[PDB]
Short mmCIF file of C-alpha atoms and ligand atoms in Angstrom, two decimals:
data_model
loop_
_atom_site.label_atom_id
_atom_site.label_comp_id
_atom_site.label_asym_id
_atom_site.label_seq_id
_atom_site.Cartn_x
_atom_site.Cartn_y
_atom_site.Cartn_z
CA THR A 1 30.43 -54.46 163.98
CA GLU A 2 31.71 -50.94 164.81
CA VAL A 3 33.77 -49.66 167.77
CA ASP A 4 32.59 -46.89 170.14
CA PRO A 5 35.61 -45.41 172.07
CA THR A 6 33.15 -43.75 174.56
CA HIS A 7 31.60 -47.15 175.56
CA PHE A 8 33.07 -48.77 178.67
CA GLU A 9 32.08 -52.30 179.80
CA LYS A 10 31.51 -52.58 183.62
CA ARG A 11 33.23 -56.04 183.65
CA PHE A 12 36.59 -54.40 182.76
CA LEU A 13 36.17 -51.59 185.34
CA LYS A 14 38.29 -52.36 188.43
CA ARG A 15 37.82 -50.10 191.53
CA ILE A 16 41.08 -48.79 193.16
CA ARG A 17 39.84 -46.05 195.62
CA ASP A 18 37.07 -43.49 196.33
CA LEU A 19 37.56 -39.97 194.91
CA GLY A 20 34.40 -38.44 196.43
CA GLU A 21 30.75 -39.03 197.45
CA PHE A 22 23.16 -39.91 195.88
CA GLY A 23 26.41 -40.10 193.89
CA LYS A 24 29.94 -41.49 194.26
CA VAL A 25 33.17 -41.06 192.30
CA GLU A 26 35.74 -43.85 192.15
CA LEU A 27 39.20 -44.26 190.68
CA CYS A 28 38.96 -47.35 188.39
CA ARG A 29 41.34 -49.03 185.99
CA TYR A 30 39.68 -49.92 182.68
CA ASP A 31 41.41 -53.22 181.87
CA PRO A 32 39.86 -55.11 178.83
CA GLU A 33 43.16 -57.07 178.41
CA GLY A 34 43.06 -58.14 182.10
CA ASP A 35 46.84 -57.64 182.60
CA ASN A 36 46.89 -54.39 184.70
CA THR A 37 48.19 -52.24 181.78
CA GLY A 38 44.82 -50.46 181.29
CA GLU A 39 44.11 -46.75 181.76
CA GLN A 40 42.96 -45.25 185.10
CA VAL A 41 39.65 -43.34 184.85
CA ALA A 42 37.29 -41.53 187.27
CA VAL A 43 33.88 -43.28 187.41
CA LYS A 44 30.76 -41.52 188.73
CA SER A 45 27.88 -43.85 189.75
CA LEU A 46 24.66 -43.63 191.75
CA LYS A 47 24.62 -44.87 195.35
CA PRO A 48 21.66 -47.24 196.10
CA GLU A 49 21.26 -45.48 199.53
CA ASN A 50 16.09 -43.19 191.71
CA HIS A 51 18.25 -40.24 190.56
CA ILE A 52 19.08 -41.78 187.12
CA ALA A 53 17.58 -38.79 185.21
CA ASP A 54 19.85 -36.40 187.20
CA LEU A 55 23.01 -38.41 186.36
CA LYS A 56 21.93 -38.65 182.68
CA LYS A 57 21.46 -34.84 182.57
CA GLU A 58 24.97 -34.43 184.18
CA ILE A 59 26.46 -36.76 181.52
CA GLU A 60 24.76 -34.74 178.72
CA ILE A 61 25.98 -31.46 180.24
CA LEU A 62 29.60 -32.73 180.61
CA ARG A 63 29.71 -34.50 177.18
CA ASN A 64 29.16 -31.07 175.51
CA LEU A 65 31.57 -28.92 177.56
CA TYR A 66 34.91 -28.46 175.73
CA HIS A 67 37.24 -26.22 177.76
CA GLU A 68 40.81 -26.61 179.01
CA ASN A 69 39.64 -25.77 182.58
CA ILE A 70 36.76 -28.29 182.59
CA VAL A 71 37.40 -32.01 183.34
CA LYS A 72 37.11 -34.23 180.21
CA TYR A 73 34.25 -36.65 179.61
CA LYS A 74 35.62 -40.03 178.41
CA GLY A 75 32.37 -41.97 178.11
CA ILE A 76 29.56 -43.96 179.67
CA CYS A 77 29.04 -47.40 181.12
CA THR A 78 25.57 -48.91 180.51
CA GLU A 79 24.29 -52.45 181.21
CA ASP A 80 22.48 -54.27 178.30
CA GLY A 81 19.33 -54.75 180.44
CA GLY A 82 18.73 -50.97 180.39
CA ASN A 83 19.13 -50.63 184.19
CA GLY A 84 21.56 -47.82 185.05
CA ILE A 85 24.43 -45.67 183.77
CA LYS A 86 27.94 -44.60 184.95
CA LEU A 87 29.87 -41.46 183.94
CA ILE A 88 33.51 -42.06 182.86
CA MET A 89 35.91 -39.13 183.15
CA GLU A 90 39.63 -38.56 182.83
CA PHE A 91 41.55 -39.10 186.10
CA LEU A 92 43.89 -36.38 187.44
CA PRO A 93 46.48 -37.97 189.76
CA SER A 94 47.31 -34.73 191.63
CA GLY A 95 43.69 -34.71 192.90
CA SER A 96 41.87 -31.55 193.94
CA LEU A 97 43.24 -28.23 195.39
CA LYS A 98 42.26 -29.69 198.82
CA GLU A 99 44.98 -32.40 198.53
CA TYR A 100 47.41 -30.57 196.23
CA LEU A 101 47.80 -27.18 198.01
CA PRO A 102 48.76 -28.40 201.58
CA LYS A 103 51.38 -30.74 199.98
CA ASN A 104 52.90 -28.13 197.60
CA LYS A 105 52.82 -24.91 199.71
CA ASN A 106 56.61 -24.44 199.14
CA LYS A 107 56.22 -24.92 195.35
CA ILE A 108 53.08 -22.68 194.91
CA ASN A 109 53.42 -18.88 195.24
CA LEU A 110 50.87 -16.00 194.91
CA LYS A 111 51.47 -15.65 191.11
CA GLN A 112 50.61 -19.36 190.52
CA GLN A 113 47.55 -18.99 192.85
CA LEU A 114 46.27 -16.02 190.80
CA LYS A 115 46.75 -18.07 187.58
CA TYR A 116 44.57 -20.87 189.07
CA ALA A 117 42.00 -18.13 190.00
CA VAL A 118 41.92 -16.94 186.29
CA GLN A 119 41.47 -20.59 185.09
CA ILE A 120 38.59 -21.26 187.51
CA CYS A 121 36.96 -17.95 186.31
CA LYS A 122 37.45 -18.96 182.64
CA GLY A 123 35.91 -22.43 183.12
CA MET A 124 33.05 -20.81 185.11
CA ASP A 125 32.55 -18.02 182.51
CA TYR A 126 32.34 -20.65 179.72
CA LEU A 127 29.73 -22.59 181.81
CA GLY A 128 27.72 -19.41 182.52
CA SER A 129 27.72 -18.31 178.82
CA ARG A 130 26.14 -21.76 178.05
CA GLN A 131 23.27 -20.82 180.53
CA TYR A 132 24.39 -23.08 183.42
CA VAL A 133 24.59 -22.61 187.20
CA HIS A 134 27.24 -24.78 188.85
CA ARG A 135 25.95 -24.58 192.52
CA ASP A 136 28.92 -26.48 194.03
CA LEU A 137 32.02 -24.40 193.32
CA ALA A 138 34.56 -25.21 196.08
CA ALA A 139 38.32 -26.07 196.15
CA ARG A 140 37.47 -29.79 196.70
CA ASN A 141 35.88 -29.63 193.15
CA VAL A 142 38.88 -27.93 191.54
CA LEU A 143 41.25 -30.59 190.11
CA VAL A 144 44.96 -30.17 189.45
CA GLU A 145 46.02 -31.11 185.88
CA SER A 146 49.64 -29.96 186.50
CA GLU A 147 51.43 -27.26 188.54
CA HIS A 148 50.29 -24.79 185.80
CA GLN A 149 46.72 -26.02 185.14
CA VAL A 150 43.45 -26.57 187.07
CA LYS A 151 40.05 -27.99 185.95
CA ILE A 152 36.52 -27.89 187.43
CA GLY A 153 35.96 -31.58 188.17
CA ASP A 154 32.40 -32.16 189.33
CA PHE A 155 29.05 -31.14 187.91
CA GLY A 156 26.63 -33.03 190.22
CA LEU A 157 24.54 -29.90 191.03
CA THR A 158 24.88 -28.10 187.64
CA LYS A 159 21.52 -26.82 186.34
CA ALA A 160 20.35 -25.08 183.18
CA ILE A 161 18.89 -21.60 183.73
CA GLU A 162 15.60 -21.57 181.71
CA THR A 163 15.33 -19.08 178.76
CA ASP A 164 14.07 -15.51 179.68
CA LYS A 165 14.98 -16.23 183.38
CA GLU A 166 17.94 -14.99 185.51
CA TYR A 167 17.99 -17.98 187.86
CA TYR A 168 17.33 -21.61 188.83
CA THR A 169 14.77 -22.20 191.64
CA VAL A 170 16.22 -24.75 194.16
CA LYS A 171 13.86 -27.45 195.53
CA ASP A 172 16.23 -30.07 197.09
CA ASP A 173 18.54 -28.07 199.41
CA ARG A 174 19.19 -30.62 202.24
CA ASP A 175 22.90 -31.18 201.38
CA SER A 176 23.70 -27.57 200.34
CA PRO A 177 27.31 -26.33 200.95
CA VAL A 178 25.87 -23.43 203.02
CA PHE A 179 29.30 -21.87 203.78
CA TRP A 180 29.90 -21.30 200.05
CA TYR A 181 26.36 -19.95 199.44
CA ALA A 182 25.16 -16.41 198.63
CA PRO A 183 22.29 -14.95 200.79
CA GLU A 184 19.73 -15.25 197.89
CA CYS A 185 20.43 -19.05 197.79
CA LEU A 186 20.16 -19.43 201.57
CA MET A 187 17.07 -17.14 201.90
CA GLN A 188 15.08 -17.52 198.65
CA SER A 189 16.42 -20.83 197.20
CA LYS A 190 17.24 -18.94 193.93
CA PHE A 191 20.41 -19.63 191.92
CA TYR A 192 21.89 -16.93 189.66
CA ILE A 193 25.23 -16.77 187.79
CA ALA A 194 26.21 -14.14 190.43
CA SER A 195 25.60 -16.86 193.11
CA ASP A 196 28.43 -18.88 191.43
CA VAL A 197 30.52 -15.63 191.65
CA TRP A 198 29.90 -15.55 195.47
CA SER A 199 30.99 -19.24 195.66
CA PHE A 200 34.12 -18.41 193.61
CA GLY A 201 35.11 -15.72 196.15
CA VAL A 202 34.86 -18.41 198.87
CA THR A 203 36.91 -20.88 196.72
CA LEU A 204 39.48 -18.05 196.11
CA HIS A 205 39.75 -17.66 199.92
CA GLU A 206 40.45 -21.46 200.24
CA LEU A 207 43.12 -21.29 197.49
CA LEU A 208 44.88 -18.37 199.26
CA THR A 209 44.84 -20.30 202.60
CA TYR A 210 46.31 -23.35 200.72
CA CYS A 211 43.13 -25.35 201.69
CA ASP A 212 44.18 -25.68 205.36
CA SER A 213 41.31 -27.28 207.35
CA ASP A 214 41.74 -24.87 210.31
CA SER A 215 41.33 -21.87 207.92
CA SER A 216 38.37 -23.48 205.98
CA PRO A 217 35.26 -21.27 205.31
CA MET A 218 33.25 -23.64 207.55
CA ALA A 219 35.84 -23.42 210.43
CA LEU A 220 36.04 -19.60 210.07
CA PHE A 221 32.26 -18.98 209.81
CA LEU A 222 31.58 -21.33 212.80
CA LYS A 223 34.13 -19.32 214.87
CA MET A 224 32.27 -16.10 213.84
CA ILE A 225 28.68 -17.32 214.45
CA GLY A 226 29.11 -20.15 217.00
CA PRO A 227 29.75 -23.88 216.37
CA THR A 228 26.82 -25.35 218.45
CA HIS A 229 23.66 -23.71 216.93
CA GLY A 230 22.54 -26.93 215.11
CA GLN A 231 19.32 -26.27 213.12
CA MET A 232 19.81 -22.48 213.78
CA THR A 233 23.23 -22.35 211.96
CA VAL A 234 21.81 -21.09 208.60
CA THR A 235 19.71 -18.25 210.15
CA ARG A 236 22.75 -17.14 212.23
CA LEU A 237 24.85 -17.38 209.03
CA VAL A 238 22.30 -15.24 207.05
CA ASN A 239 22.12 -12.58 209.88
CA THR A 240 25.94 -12.34 209.94
CA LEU A 241 25.93 -11.80 206.11
CA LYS A 242 23.03 -9.25 206.45
CA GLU A 243 25.26 -7.37 208.98
CA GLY A 244 27.97 -7.07 206.28
CA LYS A 245 30.35 -9.54 208.01
CA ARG A 246 32.56 -11.51 205.58
CA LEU A 247 35.46 -14.03 205.76
CA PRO A 248 38.73 -12.29 206.87
CA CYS A 249 41.76 -11.50 204.64
CA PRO A 250 44.01 -14.60 204.28
CA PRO A 251 47.50 -14.29 205.91
CA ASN A 252 50.03 -12.62 203.52
CA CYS A 253 47.26 -11.87 200.94
CA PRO A 254 47.61 -8.32 199.44
CA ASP A 255 44.57 -5.98 199.73
CA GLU A 256 44.13 -5.64 195.91
CA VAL A 257 43.49 -9.45 195.73
CA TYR A 258 41.25 -9.26 198.87
CA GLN A 259 39.25 -6.36 197.30
CA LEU A 260 38.45 -8.52 194.23
CA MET A 261 37.27 -11.27 196.65
CA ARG A 262 35.01 -8.69 198.45
CA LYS A 263 33.41 -7.81 195.07
CA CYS A 264 32.25 -11.48 194.84
CA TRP A 265 30.54 -11.01 198.22
CA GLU A 266 28.18 -8.01 197.61
CA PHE A 267 24.82 -8.82 199.33
CA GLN A 268 22.75 -8.10 196.18
CA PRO A 269 23.55 -10.38 193.17
CA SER A 270 23.37 -7.41 190.71
CA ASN A 271 26.04 -5.47 192.70
CA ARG A 272 28.53 -8.41 192.48
CA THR A 273 31.44 -8.49 190.02
CA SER A 274 31.21 -10.79 186.97
CA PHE A 275 33.70 -13.52 185.92
CA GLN A 276 34.73 -11.26 182.95
CA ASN A 277 35.71 -8.48 185.42
CA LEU A 278 37.44 -10.96 187.79
CA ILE A 279 39.55 -12.31 184.85
CA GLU A 280 40.45 -8.67 183.86
CA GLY A 281 41.27 -7.89 187.52
CA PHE A 282 43.62 -10.89 188.06
CA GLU A 283 45.28 -10.47 184.60
CA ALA A 284 46.08 -6.83 185.66
CA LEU A 285 47.91 -8.22 188.76
CA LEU A 286 49.87 -10.87 186.78
CA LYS A 287 51.54 -8.20 184.53
C1 0UJ B 301 40.08 -37.12 197.87
S1 0UJ B 301 41.13 -37.33 196.40
O1 0UJ B 301 40.73 -38.48 195.67
O2 0UJ B 301 42.50 -37.14 196.73
N1 0UJ B 301 40.82 -36.04 195.39
C2 0UJ B 301 39.49 -35.88 194.78
C3 0UJ B 301 39.46 -36.17 193.28
N2 0UJ B 301 40.51 -36.43 192.57
C4 0UJ B 301 40.17 -36.60 191.28
C5 0UJ B 301 40.93 -36.91 190.14
N3 0UJ B 301 40.37 -37.05 188.96
C6 0UJ B 301 39.06 -36.88 188.77
N4 0UJ B 301 38.29 -36.93 187.63
C7 0UJ B 301 36.98 -36.68 187.95
C8 0UJ B 301 36.87 -36.47 189.28
C9 0UJ B 301 38.21 -36.58 189.87
C10 0UJ B 301 38.76 -36.44 191.18
N5 0UJ B 301 38.35 -36.17 192.48
C11 0UJ B 301 37.00 -35.88 193.03
C12 0UJ B 301 35.77 -36.55 192.37
C13 0UJ B 301 34.84 -35.32 192.07
C14 0UJ B 301 34.27 -34.84 193.45
C15 0UJ B 301 35.53 -34.21 194.18
C16 0UJ B 301 36.66 -34.35 193.10
C17 0UJ B 301 35.89 -34.20 191.74
#
């Protein structure tokens, strides 16, 4: 009778709090000894409110990503009856950039922010080179490993780009993070690697504003276009982008950093900078 270190029994999984939420992520303590000494893990499960194939594809994607800036897969939790699966990941106590940055503003300077930018680009470049589109790159999905290290922590919308194709055609777009989305995603429901570059520029803007809610891309775009357009919000967002309007320069952000951000926001995907170029650009500012 052999031992699988990637197999977690649901009986020993004890919920502590919600980390995020068709899917939900919870902080759990895996306690097979039942004495509260067990390890804390992040557990992704389906909400009953079936998307089992989607979660299984996410698990298979994450199980085969090995990068310092990508959250670690720990294992799976399956029930003997064959009904359902849970994704088990490592837990990062500092949380995402959304929680970490407002709390550590005095500790985190521009140099450390640019190092996080490089790490996000590296994790994203590794993902892209493996023919994947992330589709949900935002600061809330960037986890803090330590003051010196960040990791992409959620892959719920990650899709494989088919061979001999430049993009993924989006069908389900109801819960799209529209304020992080490139015009081709909003207008044609097409997802390219360059669309993840656009989303990175938006995430870079959040990082430079220390994830303050009043300076969020949603709060800023709604001030630009109007906050009471309801079902017309996306069209008014697309027109604004078609006009060449973009998010403004963060306070105390030097122009050279802002210019790299603007290269992520070129209207045409082909005219946008790559993650390789972004990495080179930030590295040139760090030395
Ligand atoms: C509100 S909070 O809970 O303060 N911080 C959020 C958080 N913190 C996380 C810590 N470790 C994690 N391991 C895997 C995910 C994960 C964490 N998450 C979330 C679950 C996934 C969707 C948003 C991120 C990633």
